[PDB]
Amino acid sequence: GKLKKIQKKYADQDETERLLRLEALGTLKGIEKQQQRKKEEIMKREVRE
Amino acid sequence: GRVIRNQRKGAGSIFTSHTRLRQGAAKLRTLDYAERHGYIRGIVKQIVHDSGRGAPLAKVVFRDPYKYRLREEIFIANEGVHTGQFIYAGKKASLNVGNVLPLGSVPEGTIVSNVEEKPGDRGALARASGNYVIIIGHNPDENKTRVRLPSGAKKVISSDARGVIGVIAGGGRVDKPLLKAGRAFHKYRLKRNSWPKTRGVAMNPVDHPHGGGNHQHIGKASTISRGAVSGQKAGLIAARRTGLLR
Amino acid sequence: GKGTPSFGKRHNKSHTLCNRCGRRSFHVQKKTCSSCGYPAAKTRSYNWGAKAKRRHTTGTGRMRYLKHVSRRFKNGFQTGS
RNA sequence: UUGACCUCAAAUCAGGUAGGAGUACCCGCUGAACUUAAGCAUAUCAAUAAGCGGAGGAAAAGAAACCAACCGGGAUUGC
RNA sequence: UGGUGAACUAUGCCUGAAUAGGGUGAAGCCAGAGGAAACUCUGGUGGAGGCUCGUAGCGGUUCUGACGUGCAAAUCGAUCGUCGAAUUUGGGUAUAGGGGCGAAAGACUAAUCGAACCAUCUAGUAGCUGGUUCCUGCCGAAGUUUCCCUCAGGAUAGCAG
RNA sequence: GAUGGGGAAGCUCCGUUUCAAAGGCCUGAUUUUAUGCAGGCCACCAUCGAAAGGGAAUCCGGUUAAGAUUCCGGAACCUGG
RNA sequence: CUUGUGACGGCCCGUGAAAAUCCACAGGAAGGAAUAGUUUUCAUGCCAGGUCGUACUGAUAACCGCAGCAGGUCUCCAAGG
RNA sequence: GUGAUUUCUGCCCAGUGCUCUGAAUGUCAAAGUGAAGAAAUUCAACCAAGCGCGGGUAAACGGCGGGAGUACUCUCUUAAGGUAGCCAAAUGCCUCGUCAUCUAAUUAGUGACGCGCAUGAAUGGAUUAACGAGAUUCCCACUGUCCCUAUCUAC
RNA sequence: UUUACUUAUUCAAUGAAGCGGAGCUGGAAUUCAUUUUCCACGUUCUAGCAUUCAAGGUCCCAUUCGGGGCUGAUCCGGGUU
RNA sequence: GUGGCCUAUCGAUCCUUUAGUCCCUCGGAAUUUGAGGCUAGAGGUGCCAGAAAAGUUACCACAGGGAUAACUGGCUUGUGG
Ligand SMILES: [Mg+2]
Ligand SMILES: [Mg+2]
Ligand SMILES: [Zn+2]
């Protein structure tokens, strides 16, 4: 479902535009937060040890 | 409830555009044989004012290559075009302001206007006063050109589409304050019936979603879904964000 | 002043005489008669307007040809003298 | 070049035919709600009223892709 | 359910028409003066403005005046707002009823609008109000039990013929 | 607002130059002659819509109970042939 | 004073109809004279101009407001102090 | 949506909306697939969008609290605790708030004050020349509004 | 899931005019034998002008008043693009 | 001894489901699934003899009511005097 949408509206786009758009939307921040959580899980195990 | 005003606008009873004093559709010359194998020379006879349009128009006269007669096209005047100027339209036309070169034959950084979307619709992009299209890049294999539009968008259109070199005349118009409801009246009097505008929050609830209440307030959120139906789409339709950014 | 002063502004007919019925029911701007239907081919009649059908039906006029059809039938549509 | 065939046209071509009215009864389409349910939504009113198309002195149906389960009947219609 | 209305009025379009006399005195320009220069000052000219006083016109603030079985189903008198434009208006034309049009009052849409008018369905339904037409004779009550979206009504038992 | 078309069970709806084989114009030629055949030209593409818009051309004098730039007398103008 | 007009000036993010109709120019098709023509955008001369409306009021009595209603209803002309 | 100019528009994305090109089995229709059955059928797996999970967004709807110490600090709670301004204001119940002024006397007016029932920032906040048949207070002039009535004209 | 193909279907333009392939003629081109290719393939100081199946060349006709064919203006496929 | 020492401690039709009879029917004749019946329970209506159910109206409407409020009058006089 995601693929169809990307092809439909974002085919005529450049990476610089994509990054700018994603930041304005705030989608990028969310991805970062998920990654941070994953690091946190590893960190917790280390602290316990 | 009643049928709301923007719902009523689509019937086109009193909401049609006032087109009595307009001088014709401002289109490019049709892409017959001369414009795609060579060029053709016409003459600017007069630059005139178009009712309901911020930009002036140019009346360019060409000769019909197949019959002894004269053709008169209405171009949108570029800033710098004068009366008596020779206008060159075609594939082999030289790169000067007012010429009607196709987009495949202009280099990087060229500023054009009255750009066709597909080759042959005789002008679609950058037609209002002061607007222009910049050529951002070429692609010879799978022959396309990237262009920057007046909205800041980047389109990838065919390299056989045509465009008039330069910017549309009459720019800087909206920098002057209107100062007067009479001036806004005379502005929209030759466009269409859209002014004055009553705030839907100042209506009765039969007339608008925003109407009613013992205080003038909207009630629910003013951001409206794209999947909403007619009579509901009153407000900010499909807003990704709201508010004044700093 | 929606009453007596507004009744003084009335001097432009909305309806004029119709060609099929002579009724003064022919709308000038719609170009249609509101009683019979002209310019339409069929004649305007409705089953809720049964009294209007009685007003405009067959037999309310001269029957310039239909008066003699029963008599010609009774004689058997004879010819000669 | 000439002559066919097929398909498609044009004629104030020769001769015809359709429309509209009436509409009680008839053959179809479309199609409500008031009402009743002591409220009301399925239901009912009603496969009705209004609207539309089409006939005749009648129309329609009609000589079984029927009814039956009996010792079987035998087109349709009506009481 | 099916029809009829924009002759009033709301709005857009097309084509026409109408609007004394004053007050203020905007740009532009001319002359003189000053200054070292930037430029400033003085006197004229000019005649701008959804400017202003005020007729015709358009409207309708107050007297809560007159009238209030009126001249009139909205008028009369004085006092008023505005008066070169977002002005006023004729004719043509477009939009039709859960629809129109609205500088937005639920306003206007033919004295009808918080859903016009006409005809039909329709003799719509009403536990609710009113009425219900001659005489005499004989007998003669109940407002209580139980159940009910029952509490202005019914059923059932009782009382009566 | 017809037509060509396309919707709609249908009353009818859309559209007005559209996915149409959409017509008429002058010279003449022929002088069995009628108007075909010699030709050649042209592609708008129904029609309705203003008694205030556009628009060929008339004035004076007199005259009636009641008509007049309309009648009478005089003097003009335009269009078609 | 009313009205017509000319040359200008100011204003606009307003720059303020269309068609019928008429004329001219470019072009050089074709037709053309010498005992004769060619021209009717010069002058004079001839004939015809069909159909419908045409009176009156236009408002404190001819229109609309149940009426001979102090209401409403578009416009032209405009003497002296 | 707000409503000239000037000057500003604070904090909050937890809720309700709106919006993502994120990540992907939780919810999970019809068709299709598999198994059982003699078949009707039953049972599972798979399973689009949207929900659900994760972000953004307040000139989107809106919201802007308590307990201690000495305006300031600490603590609890919460998404964040009313910022700049303004006020008995057309918004203040108590209330005819308190002080000053205006008057002989003022529930009226104005200027201040602010624990403000229940002020507050495009729900726009504050200010503001000119304008107003808008609402309110005071002063001069003026008068039959009144003390306190009288007279005249027309109909 | 990606990706061809075009004739169904869809969009657009034009009074369905210059589509595609091949060939000339020039330029670059390096040819490793003879041409592999690729670009072109009548118009740019100037508010004039560009039309009569086109002049010329050539071949017929029956010369005369002229008329016709080819070329000028390269072939092939009828897919309007 | 046919529940609780006695006086309270609870629920129709339709539908679903369970137990029993393994009985009756599926109507052209049979077998087997499936379905429908008979007898006795359960799933529940607390508004408890048992509708499936949010507001607002200062724009409001209709049928009624002095069976019924918001004055005065009347009875009473707690309270007030
Ligand atoms: Mg408007
Ligand atoms: Mg509201
Ligand atoms: Zn008629």
Side-chain angles (χ1 to χ4, degrees):
Chain A
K2 300 172 181 53
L3 294 172
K4 297 165 57 64
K5 299 184 60 177
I6 297 171
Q7 303 181 1
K8 186 64 183 301
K9 297 182 175 182
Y10 317 115
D12 285 359
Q13 222 214 3
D14 35 281
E15 268 291 332
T16 57
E17 267 183 347
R18 189 200 76 170
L19 294 176
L20 291 173
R21 284 300 191 91
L22 261 44
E23 192 56 57
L25 289 166
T27 339
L28 284 180
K29 178 176 186 177
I31 314 173
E32 300 159 8
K33 298 181 70 173
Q34 298 175 7
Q35 296 159 352
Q36 293 155 12
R37 292 179 173 95
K38 308 173 184 180
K39 303 162 192 169
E40 226 69 35
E41 301 154 2
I42 315 174
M43 154 305 306
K44 291 174 180 179
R45 310 156 199 172
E46 298 160 358
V47 165
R48 293 181 306 177
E49 297 154 7
Chain B
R2 217 199 295 276
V3 181
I4 62 171
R5 174 194 51 211
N6 60 265
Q7 214 171 355
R8 278 167 36 215
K9 277 201 182 189
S13 86
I14 56 155
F15 298 103
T16 51
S17 70
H18 315 147
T19 54
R20 196 245 302 173
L21 287 175
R22 287 164 205 233
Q23 283 153 0
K27 302 179 163 314
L28 279 182
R29 180 183 152 84
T30 179
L31 183 66
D32 48 357
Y33 167 72
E35 271 206 30
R36 50 178 172 86
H37 277 49
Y39 59 93
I40 190 167
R41 189 192 78 170
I43 190 167
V44 176
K45 296 310 270 294
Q46 63 204 300
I47 293 162
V48 289
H49 166 83
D50 199 14
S51 283
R53 190 200 295 270
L57 297 181
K59 302 201 165 177
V60 188
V61 161
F62 296 91
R63 290 168 46 234
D64 186 350
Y66 309 107
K67 199 190 148 80
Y68 182 52
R69 63 160 71 179
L70 269 67
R71 293 331 191 71
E72 191 255 350
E73 322 276 340
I74 297 89
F75 285 3
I76 309 185
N78 264 1
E79 182 155 350
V81 186
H82 60 281
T83 51
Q85 186 180 322
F86 285 132
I87 296 306
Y88 295 86
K91 187 198 182 185
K92 298 306 198 66
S94 76
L95 188 153
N96 284 265
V97 302
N99 290 7
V100 178
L101 280 84
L103 295 197
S105 57
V106 288
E108 181 65 26
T110 317
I111 296 89
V112 294
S113 69
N114 209 7
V115 187
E116 293 182 322
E117 271 156 329
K118 310 165 169 171
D121 54 300
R122 310 163 64 169
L125 313 166
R127 312 173 78 228
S129 62
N131 287 279
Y132 56 83
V133 163
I134 312 167
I135 296 89
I136 297 300
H138 287 267
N139 199 345
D141 291 331
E142 190 275 331
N143 44 4
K144 302 293 180 46
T145 63
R146 308 183 36 87
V147 287
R148 207 194 67 78
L149 301 190
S151 65
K154 296 183 180 42
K155 216 172 168 47
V156 181
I157 69 159
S158 161
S159 64
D160 292 291
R162 301 168 291 161
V164 176
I165 291 179
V167 298
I168 306 290
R173 165 173 48 85
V174 299
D175 303 358
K176 180 165 153 194
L178 277 173
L179 283 195
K180 265 204 285 173
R183 299 254 177 89
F185 173 87
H186 289 302
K187 165 184 179 67
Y188 293 120
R189 194 189 107 237
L190 283 72
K191 290 173 164 299
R192 63 207 72 85
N193 194 16
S194 41
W195 175 98
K197 282 120 153 22
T198 305
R199 287 164 303 108
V201 65
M203 289 164 187
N204 285 319
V206 71
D207 298 298
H208 205 265
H210 295 170
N214 291 341
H215 304 276
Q216 275 188 19
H217 72 303
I218 298 185
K220 324 277 217 143
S222 62
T223 54
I224 312 298
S225 173
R226 188 150 288 279
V229 304
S230 289
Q232 279 181 339
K233 291 191 168 183
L236 318 179
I237 297 89
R240 300 176 188 89
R241 78 171 300 279
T242 61
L244 181 62
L245 166 58
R246 286 130 199 175
Chain C
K2 45 184 173 191
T4 303
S6 280
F7 294 146
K9 298 193 188 58
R10 307 189 326 162
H11 46 74
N12 274 106
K13 304 182 211 253
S14 285
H15 295 88
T16 184
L17 312 164
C18 171
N19 283 7
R20 294 181 293 174
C21 54
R23 189 64 211 281
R24 183 178 181 270
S25 295
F26 186 75
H27 207 266
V28 180
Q29 305 197 225
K30 293 177 184 179
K31 292 302 196 301
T32 309
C33 174
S34 61
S35 66
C36 83
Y38 188 79
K42 277 175 314 150
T43 311
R44 214 192 67 113
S45 66
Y46 287 106
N47 292 318
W48 45 262
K51 186 182 286 185
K53 287 221 272 214
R54 176 213 287 161
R55 278 184 201 108
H56 303 114
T57 178
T58 303
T60 71
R62 288 169 58 170
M63 293 177 71
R64 303 179 298 172
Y65 172 73
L66 212 52
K67 283 194 312 313
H68 307 325
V69 168
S70 179
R71 186 273 304 278
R72 293 201 288 126
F73 164 74
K74 185 198 71 93
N75 287 129
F77 299 105
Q78 60 187 2
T79 52
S81 65

